[PDB]
From a paper:
Recently, the prominent human gut bacterium [name] (BT) was reported to produce inositol lipids and sphingolipids, but the pathways remain ambiguous and their prevalence unclear. Across kingdoms, de novo inositol synthesis begins with the formation of inositol phosphate from glucose 6-phosphate (G6P) by a myo-inositol phosphate synthase (MIPS, Enzyme Commission “EC” # 5.5.1.4). We characterized the biosynthetic pathway from myo-inositol-phosphate (MIP) synthesis to phosphoinositol dihydroceramide, determined the crystal structure of the recombinant BT MIP synthase enzyme and identified the phosphatase responsible for the conversion of bacterially-derived phosphatidylinositol phosphate (PIP-DAG) to phosphatidylinositol (PI-DAG).
To confirm the predicted function of BT_1526 as a redox-neutral, nicotinamide adenine dinucleotide (NAD+/NADH)-dependent MIPS, we cloned the gene and heterologously overexpressed the protein in Escherichia coli. The MIPS activity of BT_1526 was confirmed using a colorimetric endpoint assay and the structure resolved to 2.0 Å resolution. Outside of the highly conserved ligand binding site, the overall fold and quaternary structure of the representatives of the family in the Protein Data Bank (PDB) is highly conserved, although eukaryotic MIPS proteins have an N-terminal extension that appears to further stabilize the quaternary structure of the protein. Overall, the enzyme described here as the first MIPS representative in the Bacteroidetes retains the key functional elements of other MIPS enzymes, underscoring its conservation across biological kingdoms. Similarly, the iSPTΔBT_1526 strain (lacking the predicted MIPS) failed to produce both PI-DAG and PI-DHC, in accordance with the loss of the myo-inositol-phosphate substrate. Indeed, while SL induction level had little effect on expression of capsular polysaccharide synthesis (CPS) loci in iSPT, iSPTΔBT_1526 had notable upregulation of CPS1 and CPS6. iSPTΔBT_1526 is deficient in inositol lipids (PIP-DAG/PI-DAG/PI-DHC) and any other possible inositol-containing molecules, such as cell surface polysaccharides and components of the capsule. In minimal medium with glucose as the sole carbon source, ΔBT_1526, in which MIP cannot be synthesized de novo, had lower cell density at stationary phase. We observed a reduction in fitness for ΔBT_1526 compared with WT. Importantly, deficiency in the ability to produce inositol cannot be rescued by assimilation of inositol from the growth medium and impacts growth both in vitro and in vivo.
Numbering used by the authors:
A (entry chain B), D (entry chain B): 4 to 239, 241, 241A, 242 to 429
B (entry chain A), C (entry chain A): 4 to 429
Write the structure that this text describes.
């Protein structure tokens, strides 16, 4: 039984002043007015073959929030409105911003729960004054309540589209809800991320949460416990948009064709606010761990020792101001075929990072809202498709193969309406 | 009921002295003696999840001919034995050839049914003297019969691994078996390819036929009629090994992610005997048509006009002696995402052409032998996976998506033993 | 004695409505008004060390026409004014065109001497009606005279910046001025190019002529004879802007480091009006011959047989609408070092063709005007630097090495003012 | 007055067991026997135009040591002979090693002056037991004396071809010979490199010294003082073989064509013993500083602020075992032309590092020997051509432009025999 998508959906974005957030916002406002097309959006454009073999838009098969019913808001450490912030990001042409300037200028960031130590390269001013991690939680819950009431929203989704936080490991404080709350109250600044405070607030307020950065946040037993108790879906993490998208397509190719891999080198140059943050090696590490993780379970080295027994995998990210938002990736893959003979594949992907990630953020938001109305909660395995590091508990492995991930999306969608695929190939 | 793989399989290769043929041969002889591994071979290495969820090697699920039971022979316009021909091709190191030298030297090409006009840049003289296309057929049937008897083969498969022939269109003479035979007898050398003579002979002699080049041959109503009458499988065409393999992996990626494509340019440089032939524009055309054909049914431009309504697709092949057998591909793909913003992907694939195609030729041969023992005949749709231009009749469309093609392979294999997939994801 | 640059210079451009012509025009108008910088212009920006070791701008060492004293006009088969033509070409942003719109709109093409057969893929109709090649000459001389009088120009230069014409060989009619005139009068439309009619008219009217395309035109004994009789400079041919620029830089590198070259493959993709024309193989050939010619005299294979005795050199140009004016080049160079061991260099040059060629066209024009005021005539060897196929008579070889070519420019400039280089390194 | 090259030259290599050293050795032994060609060697293959315009081999213009008169030896921390070490390095085919195996096996490394702290990733055993830096000096002088006597060498050259040492800055101890000696005696392990001990020993023993790594060593006032006092030439540093060679060719191209540069990103992957050492960031730094230094003096940002006022330059080196000795470089250069419009150049250079550097090491050795016999001493500015970081005192700037560097080589060679260039272009 799926609750219908009635009334307005508040989409509250952490980092609402960021490149990805503003691009998603501009694209949504323009798309719903017929001034642009939501290219790259599964929710808006993709179709599926149904049990009776009819081909339908996914949006016509399950009840999603209509773009016209979305109201955007959120938090940032810079006070600039969505228009000012989009002008700064330099992703979109002025004529695209101008077409929705009226609406953009009216989207204003609330002050952020921020800790300088977690993103050292940023120096914004628009930050809450907040006694403890737990005070951050309480202020954020207030903001959600205020926003819902002021904008007449039936439901909310909270999307983290803010900066990559410093690397931190799993620890004792993350192992249960009680321990996490205690650490929040003691103001444990080392194990409690700002992001965890927004996630807690979101779940406490019946709002699905999406982690679009590679941050340790909802991938902890404490959050699995809380989200399940509250009947809230959590999804993550790290939008899979460009270089990693490609990696989770070519690795399946080598696997499907039983070709061996000796090595895979991946590098990137980018010069945006994302890149500025990632220039701190501590923040780099968080991205690196995520990027590195996507091939092992595809190859399965223990099962195919003669193909993948010895893959040397290395990823690098380089701050490079000339590229701005347009991350450029270069990959070199050393493979081998018949009789062990080696070959090389070079890929140069000239991305527009925020262009690629904008529809992915929209899709995660709209599918998260659907998941809750469909009675789903805890880790949304079915949304692995959208993410570099698909969240999983200690009894499950992440699935990384894009094509298998897409099948998982379709399977859950069909299941939601009590249907099966019309045949194996669909 | 699948007939068991007893006794010896004769594998008769048209172009047995060629780069792909000798590479497949060397690798098979070495593999079966434990001097090399058949990397790239689905038949030898790939596994599948079965109905009860056990994972097994395909070769342990269906009865295939054991490598030890294969005997190689075939035809070429050059008289060199398989050792001399492998040394000429320069694909494999001498240390690899040396390990199986005695067996290679014993593989000697029978004189070919050849027409200089169909492959003008070749000037070998190990050719039959044959008054008519029909006499070519009869001599080829004799050779098959002689080989089976001399080598004590229970069954035969004929693999065309010879040069790409000049472009010719579908014509009246191809539209029924009666018309094709008539044209053979009248010696119509403009509509009857040499390859059609080998295909006819193979089918007439109860031998599955595989077209590993892009030649018009078994993709005609005449051959669909004949193969059905004789209960023989036919498969083709054009081994999908390198640049085109990649095309049928990336195009599914763009499709799965709802990314638009404005254009796709593919070029390559190669300096082998394959390249010598393809330097004739007439022979180039045959390859070009095949390479061009692989994206339309993936994109479906009529269904997604806003993504793929206007793809400019161009392929080039350039003779380049320095590369030898190591074809080098360069591709530039112009794509667009959210709100129509353009991006570019450049792919540089340093192929070893014959290394990539060798396991594909082996797999087509072994699966063709299985298909016949399993009572299958006519167009082997299930082997689309191995081919750039999957054969199809006028009531079916080719499927090009590698991942879907792999599912087609598994589905037929499961069906052969009366099983279903354990679940949608398997 | 160099005649001073007084009064106005008429710069009459064949193909004044083309991508390169309009880009040069816009940039000159904007530069002189301080709305842009003439990046890439030797005349505007380059310096030289003088005999007394002072470093000066070239424009301060020899008397050039000031940008403010240039008046543009010319011919095209499309009647669009320079503004409309610049908007069509899509090289420059509207904000750049807007700054000089009034001046651009006032530049209007005179009807062209055109022969459809020489550029078949173009179908403009702003063409003269002219019974014979000779009548073309006379009408073009009239246009030059009219323009000089109407715009109060002291001097004129004629720049061919129009489409690459079909390949034609040197022939009897080109071997003397008398024979060329005879062929013009007999209306021999097979050996007399339209471009030859513009060149004749320019020379007849005391106007230096620059061939910016690879056309057979002023590289004939007839034009060497005429330009000498009239004391007019002629320069050419084919602006060296992008891929070929790089070729004449890397080949000197391999030479200077005594590295061998086995092969060099050059391809590109472009979708502009240039590309439309070059899609005709006959027009392609003209470009191809020019691009192929630039390495032999650098390598000197007869002198260094062990390095360059066997270079396989191949160039391709591919029409590709998605690229528009932004030609994209890909090169693969196979080199070898110590003990013959091979290595590879891949170059991907994302050009803006008209951006690269614009300053080159301006420099050729301004240096040609200087050359005549300095009493120079016939083949301007010293301007080889700007050209893919430096013009030369039957007793001289072209010099292709960019760095040597630059030295040739400086040497002539120094000589013009009776100076020597201060030292060998300057 | 040039002393003739009589008798045998001892070429003593620090790191005689290394990839570059063994490649140079094998190539020299094979070349002098006509079993291979010394491709890449200026000394062996390059010609020059002389004052009377005759073109001659440099080796026929100045007296160099004949390859037949070279005797190789040196030091390493691994005791393996030159044959064993070359087999380990995997640069050269076995058939090339086999052809000179007899001579190679007879080249045995003397125990090294080594300090683990300066190259932490190496753990060889074949190291001297040496009380102090000064004891290292005295033992090394003994080794040189012993070698000269045992092999009947008239002259010696010492070539450092050993591992890149950790970064260290210039300091007080380097500022005079007296201070350097004092620091050596006090065993100042922090400011005195092992390399400095070999350099001191070489100069003390009348042997020119070449620094083929980027190490601080002879680029100190102390060594300038000593080398001048002893009348010994010193040259360095860091062979310029591959990616940096290219950088000092393309930067001159942009300069010569007045094109602006916004950025230049350079990365590398390599998996050899060199790469193992450079995996330590301290050792990386030494290479990085050297690689970064080569463009500033080419561009001259203060002179051309509108072209080069703001170049973002970044270099990376990545350990990557699959590449072995075959370093692979990728560069992205952001340039701009006319009216400020941006363009991009991508270079992928698949090097064989030791193949490229072997002739450079030979040339520096043979030219160093010539320099001394020609009465030259101190910093050999004229050998800048061969080096990434041309050594210079505090009153001189390095020249990096390859083409200018080549002219400097020719100028010194001509000067040595009292000749001038025949003309400016030669
Ligand atoms: N762009 C892509 O293709 C892509 C792909 C993978 C993941 N991501 C991740 O998405 C996130 C956003 O990307 P972006 O390019 O928009 O970066 P951005 O820096 O432009 O946007 C992030 C915004 O979050 C703000 N912010 C940081 N910490 C905050 C806090 N505690 N509370 C509120 N606001 C905060 C920043 O001030 C900034 O405005 C990053 O983590 C990035 O790595 C993006
Ligand atoms: N190599 C690959 O990766 C690849 C990819 C696509 C398809 N193919 C196709 O496979 C075929 C074989 O490729 P290859 O590289 O081994 O080429 P090859 O030139 O080495 O071909 C094999 C042989 O075919 C022989 N031959 C030609 N016409 C014949 C005839 N009528 N009868 C008998 N023998 C004949 C030739 O003499 C040659 O020795 C070609 O058509 C090629 O285009 C190969
Ligand atoms: N763009 C570059 O970087 C580059 C490099 C090499 C050389 N070139 C050559 O420069 C020329 C101009 O290049 P473009 O990109 O501006 O091309 P374009 O097609 O935009 O050319 C300019 C114009 O020439 C006109 N034209 C053709 N024939 C004519 C005739 N007989 N009389 C008068 N006008 C005529 C066409 O109508 C067109 O508008 C081409 O031949 C091109 O190959 C340009
Ligand atoms: N390969 C190239 O193209 C290239 C280019 C630039 C510079 N270089 C530099 O040249 C040097 C040698 O390069 P390689 O590839 O042969 O590396 P390598 O590691 O193969 O060779 C260096 C050798 O020196 C030895 N060694 C180290 N410290 C020593 C000491 N104190 N005394 C004696 N032996 C010592 C090592 O054990 C090793 O055998 C490195 O500094 C490298 O960075 C080489
Ligand atoms: Na890197």
């Amino acid at each position: 039984e799926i609750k219908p998508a009635t009334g307005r959906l508040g989409v509250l974005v952490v980092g609402v002043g960021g490149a990805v957030a503003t691009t998603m916002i501009v694209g949504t406002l323009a798309s719903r007015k017929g001034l642009a097309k939501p290219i790259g959006s599964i929710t808006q454009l993709a179709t599926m073959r149904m049990e009776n073999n009819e081909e339908k838009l996914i949006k016509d098969v399950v009840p999603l929030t209509d773009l016209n019913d979305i109201v955007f808001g959120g938090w940032d450490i810079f006070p600039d409105n969505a228009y000012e912030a989009a002008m700064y990001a330099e992703v979109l042409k002025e004529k695209d911003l101008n077409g929705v300037k009226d609406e953009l200028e009216a989207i204003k960031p609330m002050p952020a729960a921020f800790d300088h130590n977690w993103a050292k390269r940023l120096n914004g001013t628009h930050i809450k004054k907040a006694a403890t991690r737990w005070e951050m939680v309480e202020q954020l819950r207030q903001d959600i309540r205020d926003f819902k009431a002021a904008n007449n929203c039936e439901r909310v989704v909270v999307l983290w589209a803010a900066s990559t936080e410093i690397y931190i490991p799993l620890s004792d404080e993350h192992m249960s809800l009680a321990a996490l709350e205690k650490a929040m109250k003691d103001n444990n600044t080392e194990v409690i991320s700002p992001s965890m405070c927004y996630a807690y607030a979101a779940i406490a307020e019946d709002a699905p949460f999406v982690m679009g950065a590679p941050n340790l946040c909802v991938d902890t037993p404490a959050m699995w416990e809380f989200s399940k108790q509250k009947n809230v879906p959590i999804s993550g993490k790290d939008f899979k948009s460009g270089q990693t998208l490609m990696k989770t397509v070519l690795a399946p190719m080598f696997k499907t064709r039983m070709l061996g891999v000796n090595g895979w080198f991946s590098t990137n140059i980018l010069g945006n606010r994302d890149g500025e943050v990632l220039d701190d090696p501590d923040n780099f590490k968080t991205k690196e761990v995520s990027k590195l993780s996507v091939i092992d379970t595809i190859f399965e080295p223990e099962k195919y020792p003669d193909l993948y027994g010895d893959v040397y995998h290395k990823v690098r990210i380089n701050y490079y101001p000339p590229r701005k938002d347009n991350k450029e990736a270069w990959d070199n893959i050393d493979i081998f075929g018949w009789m062990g003979y080696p070959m090389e594949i070079k890929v140069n992907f000239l991305c527009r990072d925020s262009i690629l990630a904008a529809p992915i953020a929209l899709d995660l938001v709209l599918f998260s809202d659907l998941a809750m109305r469909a009675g789903m909660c805890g880790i949304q395995t079915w949304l692995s498709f959208f993410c570099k590091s698909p969240m999983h508990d200690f009894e499950h492995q992440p699935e990384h193969d894009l094509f298998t991930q897409w099948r998982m999306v379709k399977q859950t969608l069909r299941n939601m309406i009590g249907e099966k695929e019309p045949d194996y190939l669909a």
